[PDB]
Amino acid sequence: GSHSMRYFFTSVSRPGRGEPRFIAVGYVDDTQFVRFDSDAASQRMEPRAPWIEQEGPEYWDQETRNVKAQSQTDRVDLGTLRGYYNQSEAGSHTIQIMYGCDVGSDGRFLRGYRQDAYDGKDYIALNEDLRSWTAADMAAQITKRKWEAAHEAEQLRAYLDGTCVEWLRRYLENGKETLQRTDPPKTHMTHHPISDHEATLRCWALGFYPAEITLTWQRDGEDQTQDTELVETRPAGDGTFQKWAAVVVPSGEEQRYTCHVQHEGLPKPLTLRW
């Protein structure tokens, strides 16, 4: 019953083509609910969930102002890190930022996150005690000193356990029929004959929510985890997810394989067979 609120910020510098492209995305659980694209004509924080469109124009005025401020901070950080790393001024570089919080079933604060990344690699992260930083290289040690002399982990503390935990319960309350639901998987098994002596059994799990699922293609108890495609949970597009797990069972040997599905929307794990 644990819930989380995440914010993803991606700033990609485009030298010779304008200002760094900035995209901000927010997610109550696995449900995007806000949005900001710097290339869009609106130039506002936009709602992407039906339960967030009820917030007053003061909420959207503030969200736009606070996301257009991170837009500028990332815009000067791209040129700052480009000098820390001594890189050319005509290359595209990315600054990804991901922060947020995790509350429990009772709405109490569990942990808070704040992680930056420069060019896909980790740059700096906020330690689990929420007062220390982990600088991932020799150019994030300079940032670490700034963020320690400026007490950045102390100003950010009041947001990660008091402003995320409070608005997150506001979101879980407004979107109660959307975010606090568990759709169990629609599981079925498909046999695809690939040869007269070789076959493949696919174990679908469609339309489930949340995305945390587990398909396990056991064989007489001993789980295999090998010779098994287990594609990443993919968005179905309507708030539900999809995922299948195949096995390459020889022909004439199918009715000894079981597929086991574990989902928090399931009363107990399944044992789909053919």
């Epitope: 102002r65 109490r108 604060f109 009041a158 356990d161 008091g162 409070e166 608005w167």
Partner: antibody, heavy 117, light 107 residues
Framework: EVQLVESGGGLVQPGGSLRLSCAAS????????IHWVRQAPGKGLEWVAS????????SYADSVKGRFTISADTSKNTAYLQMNSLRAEDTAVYYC???????????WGQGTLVTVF | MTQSPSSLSASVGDRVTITCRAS??????VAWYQQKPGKAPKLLIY???SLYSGVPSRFSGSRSGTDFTLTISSLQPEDFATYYC???????????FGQGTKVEIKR
Amino acid sequence: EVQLVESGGGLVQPGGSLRLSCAASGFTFSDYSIHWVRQAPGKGLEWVASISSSSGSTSYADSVKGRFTISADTSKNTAYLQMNSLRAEDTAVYYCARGGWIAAMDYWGQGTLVTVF
Amino acid sequence: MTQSPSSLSASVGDRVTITCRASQSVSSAVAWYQQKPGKAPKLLIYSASSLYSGVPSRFSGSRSGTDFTLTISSLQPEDFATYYCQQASYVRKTITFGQGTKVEIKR
């Protein structure tokens, strides 16, 4: 080191204006918030209004919403509280405090007695 | 909110507990102040459990459900004052102080 001094309130008739000022000294004014808290005579602490020096985010007690406004001259180390349309229920001792990143008012002033007559 | 008791009379040595029934506050925004007569308040416990710098270790703050409690482990003749719990709402942008609890002397 961190010292808050509030001054500027006293006798006032109802339906008039006062400007309480709180000259902060001992910290970077734009790093913390300044809260105005009043202690009605004999009664308990009442939070009145707030200012975030950076981003200029005000907030009021909803009993002083349209009648009190906080301004904060960052390049004076001072937070003001203009109190228009004063009632006889606005008489109290007004403290300015400092929100110190811990969601608590760690440093307080001494008090400005506003008596509406 | 409601702060209980409205006033308790305790003697030097007792363990006193003031409770504040915040039902919608984030523990983080629950602080405990102490005001002596005619003086500015004085922060004791921030984030509902964390002692403030310099406050003696006898003060502690807890949370049993939607109920935040201040405790003075062994009362001393400097703790007789009025204790206020606050609670800030980040959605509504309000700090609300509890009604106050006065600790006094016994016979």
